[PDB]
Each structure stands twice: as C-alpha cells, then as structure tokens.
C-alpha cells in the first residue's frame, strides 16, 4: 500500500515533466 | 489521513488527464 | 513519510494549477 502511493506519486510527477515539457513546444 | 492523501492523488491525476486531452487537441487531433 | 509525501503532493498540485492557469489564459488570448 505504501508503496503502491509512492509509485502512483511518481508516475504523476513523471506525467506532469510531460506536459511542461509539450508546453514548451507551443511557447516561442 | 492515508484516504485524504489517496483522494487528493486521485484527483491531481483526473486534473492531469484533462491536460493531456488539451494537448492532443493543439497537436491538431 | 507523511511530512515528504505530502511535500511531494502540494508541490505536484501547485504545478498543475500553474499549467491550469497557462491553457486557461490560451483560450482567452
Ligand atoms: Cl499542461
Ligand atoms: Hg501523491
Ligand atoms: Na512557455
Ligand atoms: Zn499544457
Ligand atoms: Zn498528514
Ligand atoms: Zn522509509
């Protein structure tokens, strides 16, 4: 269980350096 | 506490999902 | 670790309401 939550956190995290990552695509 | 946490991930996640679709929209989707 | 789990979280909202703010103004713009 502990685990599990520290993997889904960091998963998100991952997901969200993503989308920063496709946003600075369309910005100049 | 342990359920505050999970349903606050829970829904960052949803948040983060709602992103994604706005960028496969701009990509021309 | 509640005290670094929960830093780890607040960090991840604050970062997506950011990007939140970013395609909200896109629309307006
Ligand atoms: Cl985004
Ligand atoms: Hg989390
Ligand atoms: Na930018
Ligand atoms: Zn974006
Ligand atoms: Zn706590
Ligand atoms: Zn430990």
Same mark, same amino acid.
């Given at each position: 269980?502990? *685990?599990? =939550?520290? #993997?889904?956190?960091?998963?998100? *995290?991952? #997901? =969200?350096?993503? =989308? *920063? #990552? #496709? %946003?600075?695509? =369309?910005? %100049?």
């Amino acid at each position: 269980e502990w *685990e599990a =939550l520290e #993997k889904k956190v960091a998963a998100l *995290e991952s #997901k =969200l350096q993503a =989308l *920063e #990552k #496709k %946003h600075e695509a =369309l910005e %100049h």
